């Protein structure tokens, strides 16, 4: 007597999906399992736009970029979340004209402008793009005094305010728009602010309230929080301030600097490139195994990289269009029961799964 | 290594008043001055005007009475006190952070108010020029010196000057003021002797022009947001006996920053010292002293926000301090020696000061602050000894607060001052500011 | 004698470009270093009128004799 193997039903891209194994004591039976990833990646994006008075010349570019970004998110992936916020600067004396007349409209007297605000989360992350187009169109400019703008407070709050913004366990992106330079820690001493930024979420009614109480955050602080929360920043800055943000790009890992203009191809291309470079890991699990039965795994990762033992269960690099092959061997030391049994082997975090039927002679 | 850290004398002021934000010596007897930016004051209608506390030494250091530099409240406006509906203060003294920079030289005292702002008569615009009072001859008379309170109104001129942000007394008594916000935050250095201030004083008119005043000229618009004068110091770099100014520019060159040396008689730039890393505040605090004992002053530059890769490659915020030694030909452009912090987010090098010959070996020493250093982020102050080869790379002593950490940072070491024989025993002494908890401890050299 | 216009400190540069275009079309010579727009060889009355108009628009301007 000897063992045998056969596949009940098979599907083309988890290539095998239903097979029956006629095991025997001391005779391992080995079968192949081929996997190819096809599910599109899920993505989250939060668009942070400056609104100081220097954005008057560039507001149309920002709005058109927002709509084009939403269109690309719809086109490239079936799963996406999108939201946006805004900022100008801390609300304290050296940075804003504090006279009572200019609190109403820091822009010119003829124009109408909203009063300044450190940061305002206009729209938490959501899966519907129609509201994103409708709500972005209603934004209006706001005034400020000094040329640099306090964006780093906004980036800090967006990074750390997890639940309110709506971040989930998924690849994250953050597009940053600005026509001018940036403040950073140590600038607050001019306005009598000395406490360093603690990094906690101080959002009340979708607005940053402790701007007057905490100094700006240093670049190291920002880098630490961004790395902890796994956010890839893309600076959609104006052509004028390209050099300073290019120098900043070196300090912050996993980021890129685009160009803000009526034509918005550059930042869109960076978004597409960031999406294409994503990769996952495949880990194979299995249901509870009956006594007197043993299993083993082999992995054939890309570039001919191969592993066995525990490493046979895992492949730490995979992308769309890539495939891996697994060799699984099943051995039994006896025949616990004449009646067959069914066990499930599926990869972690996926719906597709394999069913194997074990028979003992 | 001999500063008697086991039980230093401790001074305390009113709670929540930032007592000890800036400290200085006084020796017309001997006494210690402490700045209290947020302390309440008795002058009418002023909320948290700020005050400067005089704590005498020799007796029990427990008096710490305030100094009545000013008594008149927010001054009213001419042509609106009468022939108009209601009053309108022409100057807003509330929240002015008076005493944020207390500097004394001989019998004269300078107490600057960076955030003082005043509504102009021509238009209702309000801008923070800042002002500094000047006591002369042991409080015999008090002169208000506000050089940035000129006829140029808006930020395009000296409107947002915030003069008195950083100040220093030279050997000859000449006053120096660092206005970071002048000319759209290009910055400005203003100076004039006490005699000129006395000659040109005229309290009737709010706008007074001091004869013989020296000031940097407005530059091209490309140099905006330089913050020149964020931190100021004085030393002899020009070869002549006249003291030469040193000014910090933490955001001058694409935020790399640099520190300049200005001729003491014309304010023409003599040297430049570029930064090392983007957004590091190269010039947060500066000092000038003869560390190697050659007889020529040597520059020191702070950089609290500088980051460096860890042994595992992780970047961390430690800060750095640079040392430039003045050879007889002239100062070299590269830093002769660099000292790096250890604590993450330590802000090492955010407050520098000479100590004089504390160890008494013919070489001057230096103390470097670290407001957020230490295990508990209370703060820490190092002491780097001098020597023939330059400043030593290993701290000779480490000073930490004795009281347990509270729920808020103590900022211990955020403001230092030393090099004066306070105890009178023949060795220099140190004063350390701890304004986080409203204290200012004093150390003595055994 | 001379009029100075300061397009600095969180101000759109398109404003200064359009003012330069408008004044240049009227024949008054214009020069600019980076963003400090100035007028050369302008009469006192015309300079005062232009300064008043621009101040009404909300731009900070200065007159030099
Ligand atoms: C250390 O590093 C610092 C920072 O880089 C150096 O400081 C800067 O150096 C530059 C270059 O030397 C300076 O620009 C020059 O400034 C001088 C002096 O300008 C002042 O005096 C003038 C007297 O005639 C006056 O006209 C100026 O005012 C007008 O012009 C300014 C424009 O700056 C304008 O904003 C004002 O409103 C006025 O309209 C001003 O008060 C000046 O003579 C130079 O002019 C040159 O201009 C062109 C090129 O622009 C050139 O072709 C000409 O021939 C002429 O030479 C030039 O503007 C700058 O002022 C310095 N300071 C700052 C803060 O930037 C420092 O020099 C370095 N030191 C060392 C030792 O390396
Ligand atoms: C200087 O003196 C003024 C006036 O006495 C002090 O003003 C006080 O400031 C505090 C906090 O800014 C205020 O506290 C609040 O009081 C209300 C009710 O009194 C309380 O419900 C709140 O929870 C809060 O504690 C206080 O009202 C205000 N006025 C007075 C009369 O105390 C100022 O604090 C003093 N500054 C310093 C540094 O001591
Ligand atoms: C923005 O500019 C780029 C380059 O000038 C344009 O890129 C071209 O796009 C067309 C289709 O839109 C392609 O057929 C060309 O091959 C592209 N050429 C290059 C060099 O990129 C881009 O089209 C512009 N954006 C828009 C909206 O027209
Ligand atoms: C210089 O002025 C100070 C401040 O007035 C004098 O020191 C003490 O000041 C308090 C008031 O704050 C007085 O009550 C004391 O009597 C003063 N001390 C003495 C010894 O009188 C100081 O005395 C003045 N300088 C001199 C040389 O007298
Ligand atoms: C610093 O400025 C002083 C003057 O403000 C220079 O000293 C002399 O100044 C007079 C005029 O006041 C000139 O006639 C002399 O030629 C100057 N001395 C020399 C040696 O040139 C001084 O030179 C300046 N510093 C430097 C380094 O030149
Ligand atoms: C202004 O900053 C620039 C950029 O840092 C300096 O240019 C060079 O910067 C690199 C840093 O990667 C240095 O290694 C070079 O030595 C710099 N060039 C020179 C000639 O030193 C530039 O030097 C700075 N200028 C000033 C006046 O600070
Ligand atoms: C990995 O396995 C594949 C498939 O059998 C084989 O072709 C390749 O040579 C192996 N490479 C290594 C390094 O084992
Ligand atoms: C990971 O897989 C991708 C695609 O299969 C390949 O291009 C890349 O070289 C692999 N290795 C790394 C380190 O990304
Ligand atoms: Ca000199
Ligand atoms: Ca020396
Ligand atoms: Ca020594
Ligand atoms: Ca002593
Ligand atoms: Mn702006
Ligand atoms: Mn713009
Ligand atoms: Mn601003």
Residue numbers in the entry:
A (entry chain B): 63 to 75, 94 to 441
B (entry chain A): 1 to 28, 32 to 449
C (entry chain C): 1 to 65
Wording from the paper:
Integrin α5β1 is one of the principal receptors for fibronectin (FN), a major component of extracellular matrix (ECM) component that is extensively expressed in various cells and tissues. The interactions between α5β1 and FN are vital for cell attachment and migration, making them integral to various stages of development and tissue regeneration, notably in wound healing, bone regeneration, and stem cell therapy. Integrin α5β1 undergoes a large conformational change from the inactive closed state to the active open state when bound to FN. We use computational protein design to create de novo α5β1‐specific modulating miniprotein binders, called NeoNectins, that bind to and stabilize the open state of α5β1.
